[PDB]
Amino acid sequence: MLDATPKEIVERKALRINPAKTCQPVGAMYAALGIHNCLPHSHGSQGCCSYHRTVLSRHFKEPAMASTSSFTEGASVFGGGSNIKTAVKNIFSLYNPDIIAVHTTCLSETLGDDLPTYISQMEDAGSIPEGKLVIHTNTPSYVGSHVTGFANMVQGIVNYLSENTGAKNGKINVIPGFVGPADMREIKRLFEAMDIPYIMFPDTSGVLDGPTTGEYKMYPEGGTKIEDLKDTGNSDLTLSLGSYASDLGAKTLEKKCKVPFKTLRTPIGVSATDEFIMALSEATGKEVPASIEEERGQLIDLMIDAQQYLQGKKVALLGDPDEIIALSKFIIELGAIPKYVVTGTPGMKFQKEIDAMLAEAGIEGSKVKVEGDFFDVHQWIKNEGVDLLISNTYGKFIAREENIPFVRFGFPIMDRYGHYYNPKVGYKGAIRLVEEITNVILDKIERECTEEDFEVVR
Amino acid sequence: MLDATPKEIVERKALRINPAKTCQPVGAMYAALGIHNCLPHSHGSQGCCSYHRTVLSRHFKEPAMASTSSFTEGASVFGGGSNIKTAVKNIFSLYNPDIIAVHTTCLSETLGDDLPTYISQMEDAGSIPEGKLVIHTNTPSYVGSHVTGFANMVQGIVNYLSENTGAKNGKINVIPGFVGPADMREIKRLFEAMDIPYIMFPDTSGVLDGPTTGEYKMYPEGGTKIEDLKDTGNSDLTLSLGSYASDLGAKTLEKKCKVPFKTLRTPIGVSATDEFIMALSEATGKEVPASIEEERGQLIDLMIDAQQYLQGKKVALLGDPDEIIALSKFIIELGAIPKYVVTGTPGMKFQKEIDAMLAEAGIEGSKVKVEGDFFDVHQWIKNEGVDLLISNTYGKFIAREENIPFVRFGFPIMDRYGHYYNPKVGYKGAIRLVEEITNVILDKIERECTEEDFEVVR
Amino acid sequence: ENLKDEILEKYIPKTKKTRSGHIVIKTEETPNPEIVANTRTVPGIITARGCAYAGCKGVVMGPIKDMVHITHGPIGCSFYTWGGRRFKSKPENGTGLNFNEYVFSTDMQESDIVFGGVNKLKDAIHEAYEMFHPAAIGVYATCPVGLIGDDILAVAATASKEIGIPVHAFSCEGYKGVSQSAGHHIANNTVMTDIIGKGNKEQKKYSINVLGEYNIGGDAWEMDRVLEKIGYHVNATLTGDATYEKVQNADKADLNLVQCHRSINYIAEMMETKYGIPWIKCNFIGVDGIVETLRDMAKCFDDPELTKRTEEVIAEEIAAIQDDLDYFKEKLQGKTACLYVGGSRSHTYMNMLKSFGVDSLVAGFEFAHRDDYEGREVIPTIKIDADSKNIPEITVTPDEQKYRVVIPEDKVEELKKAGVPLSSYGGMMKEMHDGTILIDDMNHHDMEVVLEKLKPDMFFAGIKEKFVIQKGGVLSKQLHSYDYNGPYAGFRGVVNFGHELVNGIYTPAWKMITPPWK
Amino acid sequence: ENLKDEILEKYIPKTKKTRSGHIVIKTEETPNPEIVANTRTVPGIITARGCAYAGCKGVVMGPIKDMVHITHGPIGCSFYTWGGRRFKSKPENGTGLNFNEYVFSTDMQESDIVFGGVNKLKDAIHEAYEMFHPAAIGVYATCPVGLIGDDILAVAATASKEIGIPVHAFSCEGYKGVSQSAGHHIANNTVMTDIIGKGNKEQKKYSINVLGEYNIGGDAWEMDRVLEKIGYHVNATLTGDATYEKVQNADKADLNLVQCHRSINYIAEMMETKYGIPWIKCNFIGVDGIVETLRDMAKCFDDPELTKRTEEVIAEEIAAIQDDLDYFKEKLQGKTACLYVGGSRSHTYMNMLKSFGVDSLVAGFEFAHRDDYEGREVIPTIKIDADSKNIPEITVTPDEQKYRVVIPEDKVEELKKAGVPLSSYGGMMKEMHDGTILIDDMNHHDMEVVLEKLKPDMFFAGIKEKFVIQKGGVLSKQLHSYDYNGPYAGFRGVVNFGHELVNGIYTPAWKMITPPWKK
Ligand code: ICS
Ligand code: ICS
Ligand code: CLF
Ligand code: CLF
Ligand SMILES: [Fe+2]
Ligand SMILES: [Fe+2]
């Protein structure tokens, strides 16, 4: 499998192979589905919209609705203004969202389409019904990755909606980053256990992890409500979880509405979850309750109980920067080694943070690469093997070829059922991760050992 | 592996091989650990106590404390009265439990030791300090299984503690059966979501799934408090979850304290969880909240999303009767087939219930056996294979020899880390089961398929 | 007062007026209504359609397994072609190259947009050549490419000289045309002129090609199994499990079999013009489809041994599965279905459903043309639409050295009057029964009205519709991805399809949706 | 004032008095204190001890892989011997029988208790024979068996005559004696008289047996690898990975090596008396232990080629691991340990810890006797205790046909003077340094006082103690089960053990126990 990948490395400067990212717009689409009664709108050629809706359905095994401007060759000459104006008329009439959240594509960005002007022209024409909203962001796919698209859409939410009206709400805003609905649920559960009022946005819980009830509901029950999105400007503080996905929105809200913010790691593992809980306690004066302390102590108990199977294990990790920074720290906390650590999303922070935690732990000889791909990691593995691989579905090819215990993590995970009901954040998510990691390690040991070395207890 | 097991089926009449049960006392020990500040006491030769404590630590990766009478050959002659009287003096002085919960062994039962007399003699001697308690049950290991031992200890709790004082508490008692601490936590969570006051007993949550805090605490935080065990006589109703484990206690409480009871299946899967939630609503007039309804609908969503990998799958199941009855129903609900269904625990109920659900589903050609063992099931598999095996750790030998996807379930599970944090009951536990089942089925497909048949999406 | 009226009701007036033509009801009175197809998508309507790049790179070209396919664009165009379309490939002869597990991109960045991307494209072609030494390289345009000034034709021609293997450029920018269809046409043009007929292989006896077959879920291997058993040489399949060299030698055949009309009819027509090779419409899906196809082939070759072997193989294949066939009909008869796929499968799966006793009430295509709906006889009447007018048309002429008369005109006329579909395709509508409805570019709104009014037992579509339909308690099986199963073509495919369909219908959870407290 | 006083303080007067003798401190002034050992367990004290059935079936006999071992009892006695003790087995020569993966029992029910269990036992023996055709069948008593009147000796004898293979009964009811120890003795008696010397194999050159070695985690295979490289014939290991036939031919050796003194010394003594075969105490755990053992063996054989190969193999084995050994010492030196195991390993693991720079401050055994603590020289002074007096003693005499002089008397005396432990064992206390404490039948109370007062870096014990110790933030590695690793014996075992130990100490989570919202 992957037979064409050589052991001997010739460094590529132009040919991208098996990327560890996708493009901005699906991140903006995902963020928009975290708004209640929102139809995401893809302003470009319809291929984009179809592909982006499709990956969400493949990952979540759920519907994922979005409209498109359906550019033609004419639009490629005259711009997409006529298309989006037509689209909005059809969307409100046929599908009646409360808000259309527009993002763009490489096509409309190359063309320089002026969304603010189109939207003002829509309003002037009466195309936006009373009580309805159209918002936008710009998501050029030749910049950044899907993480950047998410970040941009959150900025667009703030730009259009957040308002400081002087009516303090006593809440903390939380921007959870590009994490799954189960992670959003777990973060909300922790706020609630701390007894801290909050506004989470975006929030895809109850949108991309919903029930079957026998009736299809185009706009699921979940998502942050428009009125609460407006009210984010009346909050005390914003917690930005994962700088790549969340800081742009947090900083925009500070500038617009004078809401201060604090940047935190995505809360995966011991220190990152601890830092999140401490930030909550420090911001509010609220004590950490026994239930949360119990969960942390159960995680520590599990880390110690399972320790022998973790110490010194070499791990290859690929994924999105916020999650992989925090997961790498957790790998170190477990006594294991982040050996090969890659993201396809550009930016210096990943490099700095990963390098710093490796140095603190005294770990030499790891490879950390920004704008690396799955081809890179496979080549590295051919030169020095690893004990564990953690990535999205596309790692499965390497795992099979190289016989490496494999943990599905991040996005997209398109080949298993129910993963989207499990958090990876918090003490609870950390417990699940340790179980999964040790299960796959032990499964391999027990499949491959000689019969005489087979064990009852482990 | 298991090379001595032939294909040609033998109907053994005397030699038990690779049993699907263990003896009563560990079940009583487990129940006793579900009482706060209780030290279980094994009245017999100390080998029993050591073995029974050991299996609990191997399963939970936790301490499991118990004292023993440490019979010698002298006891085998004069009985164990002197031993238990000496034991109680050392237990209260050194270890200061609030309650000693005594169970017996085949040795003390063969000898006919008279626990009520010994306990009355300790009181007369002044060996039981003020405010402290000694209770007992009788747990002959030649009767029943560890499930029966659990049931008997619950009866002992009722016999000594439960009292109707005329002061109605407005609560429902729940006897959760021989289920793990995670299942106890989930059942409590459901009562709390329903807003129904309750007393659960035994309750090993916070006892056999506890945190590491840096100080060893002999009596962990969890366990039902003695005052609440007394107060069970003042409740409105007892729900007995799992007739084998729980009915004896529920019936004893009805006779002693006039608290009516209702028997329910262990709540695994759709109908069995539905029946539990409906019993709660009917008993209290309380409506089912949206959160519980969402969980059910997510389970249905998952059953439908994952359906193709489940339909017609042949399953071999071994374990304890309450859990295997309910799991077998869930297998049918998933569209799969309980092909081989075995418990080591005696009793006709299992046979009747399993046979009846197979008949309702039109399923012919399955083998259901009470007092069958892992050797039986292996022989059956050699004659007609299966697609899935669900059992405790000891199924792993069959899973490897026959190359069957394997789900660890029940007791003891001694070879994985963190399993004891996941419930199998409720809609939440059902979701986890479907994920685990489909994961192991898909793992085999993707390991064994040809390269050209390897898939991205599943 | 009918279902068409009910679908149309909620549209705003401008949209209603344009959508009306896309929906027709077949009746006894008027069995062949004209439909509007292959026009622009209405913005905002929630279409299932994709783009020209999908049709060219993702669909027609990608399955060629020993060609390195480089997407010239930002990353998503590449990422979204990484394994989602299930063409199966294996190393040819156990040893040949296979790039199915990879996607290759120039990963365009801001500076490529501002200054052009031709330097990075050249460098990527050379890196791919040096690393992989493939049979050929393809370069596929995406949305920004034309607009930023990149001449990929010139870059490809330069690179091909500098590396010594073929490099083929495809101007399949996603906004071109109105759907995946333009991408088919763009692929076919370059395949025809630059690949087909470039080989040197000696033609074998009883040589056929399967055109417009992409080996989704192993379909092509299953049809080859049966064809080879009868005695045909399967010279090439365009393009499922194809090697580049087999495409180059596609002219070494006596008969082209057209499975997917929409995607490959361009090449079928041009091979007949240039080489004299006749084509027949085939359908290897469903027992009736397969049997008819094999008998039509036998009539074309008119070889006594081939005719006998055809009947022998048919009889043995059917005998092996008849118990399964009987079971599907028992379990499914009387149930109703809707079918909505891209350009072919809404039609080709109909005979199988009919054999199972399932009544197909609704069918449509994302992007098929009037000829796929109404038959090729309407081609002279098709109006040239402004939104596809710039898709290039190429013309071929007989190759003076290679052209041959394969089937003489007298025999051709005889075969056609006998019902053999030589250079013809009757279209989907003809196969549907009276009082059924056709919906071109069916959107979410349309689908919901159909579901509410007709209450079908099953609705076959794709991944975007599947869970929408199933949230409402109706089974939806995917006719693109096969729900990660296959083959669904051929005799073994009928069995695979039928068991999956029965398993879907009889899944117990469909009856558990309502909780007992409601 | 001292740690013994601190341990004793909380006991009630009766218990204090009896426990005091089980705890002794070795000092420069009194380096060889007498201990009390092998007495009854105090009821209610929270002991780690097991029963005589464990010692007989679970420990000594179970490892014989081509014998079907039938527990005559209710189900737990059988279930709790299903794989928890990690003796490893493989089919002999790739083809022989192996029942390691199975447990067998009569699954006694109330009817058997009320009416007798002998017919079910007979029927189970016949089912085992007809299904498995093993080399032999064992029948093991459990708590109810004698009390209900079942004569398993008679059942076995009747069955053996019918089926034509040996059937061996063991009256190892759990309440006999005070611990696992009685079960060892009961097993040894029947193995000696009814198994050993029943074979007819031709003795090979340089033949040794390893006695009291059970191949936990592969230990015996690792010993054997090195012994066979030097040139010994490993005639039998009692009982790790053993076939029944090898035990039958245990008399076909020139030297017995005693690894576990407690469990097998009975057979070592009896083989010397009956056959003339000498024994030496051996210790194949730790580099220093192994090296000394191999050098003692070479002294006994006094063969120039064996001696030469001994030194070549020692040098090559050590060279291959010296970098690991250096790392263990670097990472562990200066740390402190406690050891609490059953009857041997508290002692045999000491030299390895000492080589790593670890200071063993506390050691004890569950069930060892005074000779294991103080050395065999104290045997004549050991008082016969009432709770073990009915464990049978058998006597053997020189076999008039098979007895032979292996090492002449004058040479034995010369070898002893030279330090070779012929028919001797110095005991654990001798090896411990001054100021250390020994605790016999250490209970939970005692252990908690030790942990609080001494704050050791690590505490080696078993599964019941492990998590108690680790909940308190102290590493506990299991010296019975090896935490599901091994071999820990032999040269490769030092490396396995050391890496596991370093990995345990340096696990990061130990430093993460206090949450940041607390001091
Ligand atoms: S090529 Fe076409 S949409 Fe004919 S673009 Fe599409 S692998 Fe469909 S109905 Mo996906 S004209 Fe093929 C098709 Fe049919 S990708 Fe496949 S299933 S038979
Ligand atoms: S036989 Fe004994 S308790 Fe010597 S009963 Fe026990 S496999 Fe221990 S210290 Mo478990 S006298 Fe062996 C023993 Fe040592 S079971 Fe093992 S580790 S060396
Ligand atoms: S209609 Fe088609 S798929 Fe769309 S871009 Fe255009 S050729 Fe491509 Fe590629 S990178 Fe992402 S998915 Fe687009 S927004 Fe820029
Ligand atoms: S001290 Fe030892 S292990 Fe205990 S019984 Fe006695 S021989 Fe056996 Fe077997 S069945 Fe269970 S574990 Fe006992 S209580 Fe009856
Ligand atoms: Fe879903
Ligand atoms: Fe634990």
Side-chain angles (χ1 to χ4, degrees), chain C residues 162-179:
Chain C
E162 291 187 19
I163 67 181
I165 64 165
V167 185
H168 299 301
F170 299 86
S171 288
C172 52
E173 292 85 344
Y175 58 75
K176 292 181 173 176
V178 296
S179 66

Side-chain angles (χ1 to χ4, degrees), chain C residues 439-507:
Chain C
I439 310 171
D440 178 70
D441 196 11
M442 186 190 71
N443 60 52
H444 178 68
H445 164 77
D446 301 330
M447 192 184 72
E448 284 212 301
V449 174
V450 167
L451 287 159
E452 188 209 326
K453 296 298 188 185
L454 292 186
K455 302 184 191 313
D457 296 291
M458 67 200 82
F459 200 128
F460 296 94
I463 191 58
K464 302 191 298 303
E465 304 93 340
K466 181 189 178 78
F467 301 115
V468 171
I469 297 158
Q470 299 203 154
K471 283 294 188 179
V474 175
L475 178 69
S476 180
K477 288 301 188 179
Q478 297 184 69
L479 283 183
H480 309 243
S481 71
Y482 301 163
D483 289 288
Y484 324 111
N485 301 306
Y488 284 178
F491 287 112
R492 292 179 186 174
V494 179
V495 175
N496 292 337
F497 177 88
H499 283 293
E500 285 292 331
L501 182 53
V502 173
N503 286 357
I505 291 287
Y506 292 90
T507 291

Side-chain angles (χ1 to χ4, degrees), chain A residues 5 21 46 62 90 95 394, chain C residues 15 41 45 82 102 107 471:
Chain A
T5 302
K21 58 163 181 174
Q46 69 209 349
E62 288 291 276
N90 288 117
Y95 302 120
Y394 289 104
Chain C
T15 306
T41 316
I45 213 85
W82 196 7
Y102 300 87
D107 190 17
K471 283 294 188 179

Side-chain angles (χ1 to χ4, degrees), chain B residues 23 25 45-48 51-52 105-106 141, chain D residues 51 53 74-78 80 141-143 172-174:
Chain B
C23 55
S45 169
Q46 70 212 347
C48 299
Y51 282 160
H52 302 165
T105 74
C106 49
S141 45
Chain D
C51 67
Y53 160 86
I75 199 61
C77 313
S78 181
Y80 294 118
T142 62
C143 286
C172 55
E173 292 85 344

